[PDB]
Symmetry: C2
Subunit: 106 residues, 2 copies
């Protein structure tokens, strides 16, 4: 809620979410809306970007009587997700490190 | 480096940094540049904002033979920093929660 979630972090979230199981956009969006204020019109292009970049592949599948577009984390996506997770870890520790006083320039 | 740092998070960092000890801008900026790509022209207005909002008070003090503008975390700032820390904690857990699969809409 308070802090914004950057598009890059959204990608992290999407890939992370999709890594649990293949999921359709609305599902990803609903879970992302838990921490982010992002419009579908911002989210779906991000999904598309991730697909184009090869991290997500997509297929259709009936779900509750309507064909949904499912996203699936490719191996490329999996490798990338590790990087994003790692960078997220670093981001966190660095912020916490700065915040707690350990981390200072020089 | 990878993930961007929002202005709101910068505020968190500034207040957190200033909470350790009073510090002048360059000092805060140098430590913030450790995790953020932010220009002085973006940082200093943020410092100013935090001052205006009452979270930082300022004074001058000679440091290495030049008067520096020091920032000091007010009690108001301290209370606010707790909130930002708290919100940061929530942000982190929520992201990690989503990323690790615990957190899903519904």
């Amino acid at each position: 809620m308070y802090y914004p979630v950057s598009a890059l972090l959204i990608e992290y979230l999407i890939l992370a979410i999709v890594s649990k199981h293949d999921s359709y956009g609305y599902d990803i969006s609903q879970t992302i809306k838990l921490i982010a204020s992002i419009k579908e019109s911002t989210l779906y292009p991000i999904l598309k970007k991730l697909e184009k970049a090869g991290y997500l592949s997509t297929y259709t599948q009936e779900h509750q009587g309507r064909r949904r577009k499912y996203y699936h984390l490719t191996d490329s996506g999996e490798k990338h997700l590790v990087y994003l997770t790692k960078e997220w870890s670093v981001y966190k520790m660095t912020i916490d490190g700065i915040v707690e006083g350990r981390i200072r320039h020089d």
